[PDB]
Amino acid sequence: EKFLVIAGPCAIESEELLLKVGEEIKRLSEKFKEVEFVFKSSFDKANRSSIHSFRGHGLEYGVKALRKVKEEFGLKITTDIHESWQAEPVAEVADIIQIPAFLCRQTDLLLAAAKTGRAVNVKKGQFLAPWDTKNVVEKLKFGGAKEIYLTERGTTFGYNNLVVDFRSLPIMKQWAKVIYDATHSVQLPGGLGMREFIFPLIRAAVAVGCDGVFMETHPEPEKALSDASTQLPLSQLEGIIEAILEIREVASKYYETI
Amino acid sequence: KFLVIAGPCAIESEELLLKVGEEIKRLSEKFKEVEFVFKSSFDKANRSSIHSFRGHGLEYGVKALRKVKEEFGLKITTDIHESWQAEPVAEVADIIQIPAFLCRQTDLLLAAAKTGRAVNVKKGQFLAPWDTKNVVEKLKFGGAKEIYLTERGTTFGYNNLVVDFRSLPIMKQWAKVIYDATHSVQLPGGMREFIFPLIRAAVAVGCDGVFMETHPEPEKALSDASTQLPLSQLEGIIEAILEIREVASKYYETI
Amino acid sequence: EKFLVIAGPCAIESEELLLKVGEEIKRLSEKFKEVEFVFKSSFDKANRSSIHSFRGHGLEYGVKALRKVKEEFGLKITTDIHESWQAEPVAEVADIIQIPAFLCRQTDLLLAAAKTGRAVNVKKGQFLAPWDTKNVVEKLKFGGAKEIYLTERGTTFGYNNLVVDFRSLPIMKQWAKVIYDATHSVQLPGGLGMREFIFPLIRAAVAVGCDGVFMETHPEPEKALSDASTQLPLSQLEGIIEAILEIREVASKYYETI
Amino acid sequence: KFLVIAGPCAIESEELLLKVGEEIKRLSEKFKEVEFVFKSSFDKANRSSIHSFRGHGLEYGVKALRKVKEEFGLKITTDIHESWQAEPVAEVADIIQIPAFLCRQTDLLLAAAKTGRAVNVKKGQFLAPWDTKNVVEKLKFGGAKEIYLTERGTTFGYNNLVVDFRSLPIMKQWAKVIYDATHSVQLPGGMREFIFPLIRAAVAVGCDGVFMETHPEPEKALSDASTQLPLSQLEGIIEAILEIREVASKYYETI
Numbered sequence A, C: 001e002k003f004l005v006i007a008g009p010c011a012i013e014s015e016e017l018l019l020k021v022g023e024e025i026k027r028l029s030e031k032f033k034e035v036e037f038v039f040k041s042s043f044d045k046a047n048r049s050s051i052h053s054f055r056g057h058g059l060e061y062g063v064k065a066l067r068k069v070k071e072e073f074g075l076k077i078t079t080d081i082h083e084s085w086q087a088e089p090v091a092e093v094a095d096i097i098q099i100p101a102f103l104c105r106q107t108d109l110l111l112a113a114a115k116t117g118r119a120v121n122v123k124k125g126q127f128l129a130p131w132d133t134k135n136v137v138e139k140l141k142f143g144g145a146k147e148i149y150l151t152e153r154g155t156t157f158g159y160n161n162l163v164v165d166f167r168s169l170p171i172m173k174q175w176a177k178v179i180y181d182a183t184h185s186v187q188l189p190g191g192l193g194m195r196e197f198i199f200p201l202i203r204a205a206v207a208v209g210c211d212g213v214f215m216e217t218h219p220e221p222e223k224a225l226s227d228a229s230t231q232l233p234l235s236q237l238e239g240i241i242e243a244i245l246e247i248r249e250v251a252s253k254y255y256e257t258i
Numbered sequence B, D: 001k002f003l004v005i006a007g008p009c010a011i012e013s014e015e016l017l018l019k020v021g022e023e024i025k026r027l028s029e030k031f032k033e034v035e036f037v038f039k040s041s042f043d044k045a046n047r048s049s050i051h052s053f054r055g056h057g058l059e060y061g062v063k064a065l066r067k068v069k070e071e072f073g074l075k076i077t078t079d080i081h082e083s084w085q086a087e088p089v090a091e092v093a094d095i096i097q098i099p100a101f102l103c104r105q106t107d108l109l110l111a112a113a114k115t116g117r118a119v120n121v122k123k124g125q126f127l128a129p130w131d132t133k134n135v136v137e138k139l140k141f142g143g144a145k146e147i148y149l150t151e152r153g154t155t156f157g158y159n160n161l162v163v164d165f166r167s168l169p170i171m172k173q174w175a176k177v178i179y180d181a182t183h184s185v186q187l188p189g190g191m192r193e194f195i196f197p198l199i200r201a202a203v204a205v206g207c208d209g210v211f212m213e214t215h216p217e218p219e220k221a222l223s224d225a226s227t228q229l230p231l232s233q234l235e236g237i238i239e240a241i242l243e244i245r246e247v248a249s250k251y252y253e254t255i
């Protein structure tokens, strides 16, 4: 099946930033024709740890910016919602509506996304066990969602640390397509992440077997207004994608049937 | 004064709230040194299953809670799940409760703070004790002056929560601390036998209040049936923690 | 029942150190007649993280020193063993043979301690679940142990951190007397512990209900050759004991029947 | 060359070792680029129950292992549990294995190092990856020159282990790293369905070898019956990880 690569800057710092990253993602989409690229960027970081951290420029501005990326590059779009009322307006541009990890159990939010007719990707909560995502999928199907994804992004392991239990991939695959979040899984919650572990863990993900990967990427991560310690330098995206496609190919014959 | 937040998990009916409200009113008159706050949720917005009980809506809930306050003169507290709910809930709620999964949702915290009411945030199962400092800062920036942080367990492997009592003294540095005796022993996706033992630990360590879900017939409760405390056992547990607190308070560490 | 207080310097730095601490423990034993005091000190720290850390002066020297404490103060003695051959020689002086947390599953060590006729106290491994101590007790009873204790000393919680799940107290009480280790439960494994949490957690232990407490104490912890960050200053011992006896008394009527 | 440590969990009989040894010898001839090491324990010294199978003793075990080496020319490895066992086990064991629960026992490590043999330490379920540096230092101080560290899972709540693959690159800084594919999925006090998936992850991340318990009829094994790999499936898994390693190795990070 066509492998999914969800990538883009963590936050919509500006429409300019989006177009710059979008241009590169479009270039890669022309090279890796076996991959379905989906451009991602949040119009609002509604759960920052600090009240002083960057959040965004609003839903209106964000949707407009994402619409520009789609119009200029013909790329599919995904962004996350935080409250039920945002589902409808976001659905006007987003091909995939993303549900934040902390909100994976909020029934009304899931239902709001599901009734839009768009695909829905739920980030698995850091508090959730793999088998408990079955009910998350059930809620979505109940709400009308026909294309559902579950994203592995790490599990609470002691304080300010996340561990990736790769057994979650084959478990969740039982009821939905599975995406591996390569950048959030190495973040150290409330720590201030370890970028040195992004590549090795993404290699593990495709060796185990998943339906796609999620990666935050920015031209200059150190200057990012969010996830500055974990966003992947844009220039490194192509090489990482080539590597995972190669590993996926050689491991694919061994992927177990669900 | 020591706070005791109690009531049925969900507003299954105003009748249920009245029955429980009558008992909490009685204890309220018996333990004058304790500040009682009646609690019940108008909506269980985060149930695991789509087929589980959620409630009768916000309007019916605020109505029933209004009835408890008017008929018994008890303070009220209930939780909100989206920003728009803050204002209407504040009409009756003396303390607005923020769900554990939603303790990092900035707009929900700000919305609650804006009402002028007290705010009690359930510490997320994913949050470290020291990371609650930023939660308090959001509420203060939002205008809140009476702020509570509630210990309700931390993710410990799958489908299990552990109470790290070191959290009580840590969180006390920036807010009043409440110990949730019923959700702390629940097994996500619990054991009532551990409720009393751990609540005794909480007061021995030192906290500003305790939170307990109580129901006349927990077995029939439409929510948290395995952990809600039988109404008839509430008085005994309250007297027990007051006695333990009386002796232990001598040793509570300064701030 | 008579509450147990197991206390003493972590390691047998010298026979002098033992006598100094022993004198204070003897004084307290005369005051707190409702408490059964047991003097503790390790003749060898056989599991230090670093090869460069202090271990001890040998079994022979240690046993001799402990024998001096018992002879001079009439105090019961306890120390830990690391290999089966040490059980017999240690049993000559130790009233209670202690089994290290990492070795709580080593069948031969438990059996070696059990056949001596002495009481045996097993530190619950940081990897062990409360209900899995039932088999530990079974092994001991099988080996002839008639007086058995299980000691709560924390559980692995992420990296370099331990958490005390107080539910373990009533669970383990089902099959053995339970001791709460107040100083090791706050240590941060391979961290370099937080002494500020020793007192609050010990208060929790007696409120929940246990059969005794274990505390490492040293005249000048900062100068200790082991557990310098967690050993309780000797001058603070009396006050801590008074406090837990007071809390135990008021909470005792509520202790659940196993 | 890549290391593959395999064999039945316990020496249930020299006959069993011979049957498994014959297959490992065959694969040894098929995969010349791989260094095979035959493994089996002469004693399961840490069983949960006093009534569980331990083995036939050290003498019978070393005897059977000697038979495997002599009859097949395969390297040998078995674990020790007390210091005195190091010398006699070293008579046949090319690699002395240190149990996970015993990875911090200084005298056991030194005893193993003194024999002059290679030493493979199972990382304790309680140990952080970076804390294995001190384990290596003990062995070096003891005279060991060939040192391995084996990833076998970390305590994750109760009766569960999680494999934090970040450990592979971290431990590689100071020793050769082996991934234990069978114990990493066992549930303390497991699921065979996760063995292959995680071993694929291990080679994709990068390691120096893999450890696998294999038995002709795992269902009848007297130890780790729920996780031992059926002998007939070993060849396929080895070929699979060699292919994945061949492609993935291009991306292994430098030291």
Ligand SMILES: CCC(OP(=O)(O)O)C(=O)O
Pocket: A010, A042, A045, A047, A080, A099, A100, A101, A102, A123, A153, A184
């Ligand atoms: C909050 C934002 C976010 O992800 P989580 O919900 O998994 O943390 C994101 O991908 O932008």
Ligand SMILES: CCC(OP(=O)(O)O)C(=O)O
Pocket: B009, B041, B044, B046, B079, B098, B099, B100, B101, B122, B152, B183
């Ligand atoms: C969801 C409801 C709830 O608490 P948590 O947010 O701590 O789970 C409650 O107290 O009703």
Ligand SMILES: CCC(OP(=O)(O)O)C(=O)O
Pocket: C010, C042, C045, C047, C080, C099, C100, C101, C102, C123, C153, C184
């Ligand atoms: C190793 C020494 C030791 O305890 P643990 O086994 O619980 O760590 C002790 O109390 O001396």
Ligand SMILES: CCC(OP(=O)(O)O)C(=O)O
Pocket: D009, D041, D044, D046, D079, D098, D099, D100, D101, D122, D152, D183
């Ligand atoms: C006990 C035996 C054992 O391994 P651990 O020490 O990792 O559990 C083994 O590989 O035989």
